[PDB]
Design a protein around this ligand. Structure first.
Ligand code: UTP
Ligand code: MN
Ligand code: MN
Length: 565
């Protein structure tokens, strides 16, 4: 059983694609070694196809089956609603890809009769037809990176695979409530996406302290999406089907699974057949939910197979953290070998073999880690940080070129307490946004895979919700964190942190000189910048402001939209 089959027709672009950065004063202002920064393109898709195309040998044992039955019994608890066409339409991102059938996301949100009548038609088809493979498009994705310390080798583009806009809206009607509700119900504490960054570090610490002699390790699968077998996707359906479901919801899930999720034909931008998928599609609604469940299940079973004791995992799609009781240095390494041997039998080998860790801080997952800092009162605070290379590289791209998804905004929101996000990112973009009249224009960003639409001037509020107000006061970051940040500036050619401090003094002055929510941006975001730091107090409409069901689940490649909060 092969993950993909190719006819030889190319993965084709729809427009021109820029690779290298353009040299302009504003990006220079941030980053100097321009030629360290690249965007991916169609040209490398070939390469990506090679990494992602293989055969899958799966062998399931009793541990796996036991864990499934356990997961399923929890899933039996769920009652999931069928969404209305309207409800589902309003979950569609305004810039989601337009349909083959003469209407785009705008029309769907407007509930254009062409759109809703097509969607109704696509819905009925899921009820009438139970086997005909549903068309998907395959595209090379445009993502920006910094090149490897390994000379001049670049990641090839990733491949997105997604059904037409009308299918996608149906997917929401059928499966949205499921995909939002079930993972927590089945996986409890282990379900990553139920956690704000603050809550995620909380859970990791409390877990780490709850052990007598702790021992954590990160796991990650070489192309998880290709390792997802047809069987995996039907197992995953069997979990979903344990929900109380509307009859048409049950069939829709039944049809989507056979027709779309287990695989199907791949069409390119030009309309020709590239071939066939027998693994997970990156761009369906159930991708993140599927990946997480599948990973949780395979992982959980692999512990019991390697007799690790008191495992507590955190799962975010493909990304797996595990913290457990240690059996001694030499044992641990041997058990972790066996974990991997199990996962591999379940068709999920790792990129790089897990290595046991005896400090929580050295464990990295979802590209991020726990680091330590202190607040005003000097009492020691835990927060979530990241190697700033890729964030800064993208910040330099989105400065010198208009991007659909403003990644820098996402990172400030998410990594608000971190060193580099405050001193470099915040300063750089509030500088730009002030020069060009544009603090109030709402910008599109991406949190946990869902598209959000946020105004810069609501950042003190938002940051306070997620990380608390202490995220405006942290000051004594760990040596290793400062060492890592500093070495990253040297790599990309970013002016050392000293430099941003005055760029930021100027910068808190511009904002106080303007009142309103603009001023409390200056005051709160840049209290690290003045040497005569004033005190900070819980902002008014700044949590009890706007609330919702935001950070309750992930929708990576799931086409989900929240202007929420
Ligand atoms: O548009 C896309 C396409 C794909 N993906 C997702 O990226 C993965 C492809 O890449 P990998 O799964 O091999 O790398 P990864 O571990 O870094 O993936 P993430 O956890 O960072 O997501 C797949 O698991 C796919 O679902 C997106 O998030 N967006
Ligand atoms: Mn992976
Ligand atoms: Mn991953």
């Amino acid at each position: 059983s092969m993950s993909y089959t190719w006819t030889g027709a190319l993965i084709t672009p729809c427009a021109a694609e820029e690779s290298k950065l353009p040299i302009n004063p504003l990006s220079n202002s941030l980053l100097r070694h321009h030629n360290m920064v690249y965007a991916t393109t169609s040209r490398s898709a070939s390469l990506r196809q090679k990494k992602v195309t293989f055969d899958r040998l799966q062998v399931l044992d009793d541990h796996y089956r036991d864990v499934l039955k356990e997961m399923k019994a929890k899933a039996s608890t769920v009652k999931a609603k069928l969404l209305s066409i309207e409800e589902a339409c309003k979950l569609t991102p305004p810039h989601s890809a337009k349909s083959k059938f003469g209407y785009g996301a705008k029309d769907v949100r407007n509930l254009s009769s062409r759109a809703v009548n097509h969607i109704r038609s696509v819905w009925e088809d899921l009820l009438e037809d139970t086997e005909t493979p549903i068309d998907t498009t395959i595209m090379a994705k445009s993502e920006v990176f910094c090149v490897q310390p390994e000379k001049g080798g670049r990641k090839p583009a990733r491949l997105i695979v997604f059904p037409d806009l009308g299918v996608r809206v149906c997917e929401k009607m059928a499966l949205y409530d499921v995909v939002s509700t079930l993972p927590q119900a089945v996986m409890g504490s282990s379900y990553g996406f139920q956690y704000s960054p603050k809550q995620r570090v909380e859970f990791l610490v409390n877990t780490w302290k709850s052990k007598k002699c702790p021992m954590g390790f990160s796991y990650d699968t070489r192309c998880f999406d290709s390792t997802v077998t047809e069987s995996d996707i039907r197992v995953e359906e069997s979990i979903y089907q344990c929900c109380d479901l509307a009859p048409e919801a049950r069939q829709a899930i039944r049809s989507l699974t056979e027709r779309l999720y287990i695989g199907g034909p791949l069409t390119n931008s030009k309309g020709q057949n590239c071939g066939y998928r027998r693994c997970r599609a990156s761009g369906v609604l159930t991708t993140s939910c599927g990946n997480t469940l599948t990973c949780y299940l395979k992982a959980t079973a692999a512990c019991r197979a390697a007799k690790l004791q008191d495992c507590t995992m955190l799962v975010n799609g493909d990304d797996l953290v595990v913290i457990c009781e240690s059996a001694g240095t030499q044992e641990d390494a041997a058990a972790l070998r066996a974990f991997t041997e199990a996962m591999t039998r379940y068709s999920a080998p790792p990129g790089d073999p897990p290595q046991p860790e005896y400090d929580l801080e050295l464990i990295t997952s979802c590209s991020s880690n726990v680091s330590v800092a202190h607040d005003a009162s000097g009492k020691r605070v835990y927060y979530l940080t990241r190697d700033p290379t890729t964030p800064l590289a993208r910040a330099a791209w989105e400065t010198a070129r208009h991007t659909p998804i403003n990644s820098w905004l996402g990172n400030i929101i998410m990594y608000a307490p971190t060193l580099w996000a405050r001193m470099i990112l915040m300063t750089h973009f509030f500088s730009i946004l002030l020069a060009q009249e544009q603090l109030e224009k709402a910008l599109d960003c991406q949190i946990y895979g869902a598209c959000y639409s946020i105004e810069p001037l609501d950042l003190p509020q938002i940051i306070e919700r997620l990380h608390g107000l202490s995220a405006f006061t942290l000051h004594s970051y760990s040596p290793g964190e400062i060492n890592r940040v500093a070495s990253c500036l040297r790599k990309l050619g970013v002016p050392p942190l000293r430099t941003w401090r005055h760029r930021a003094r100027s910068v808190r002055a511009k904002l106080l000189s303007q009142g309103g929510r603009a001023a409390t941006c200056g005051r709160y975001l840049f209290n690290w910048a003045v040497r005569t730091k004033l005190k900070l107090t819980p902002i008014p409409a700044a949590s009890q402001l706007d609330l919702s069901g935001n950070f309750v689940a992930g929708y990576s490649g799931g086409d989900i939209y929240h202007s929420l909060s």
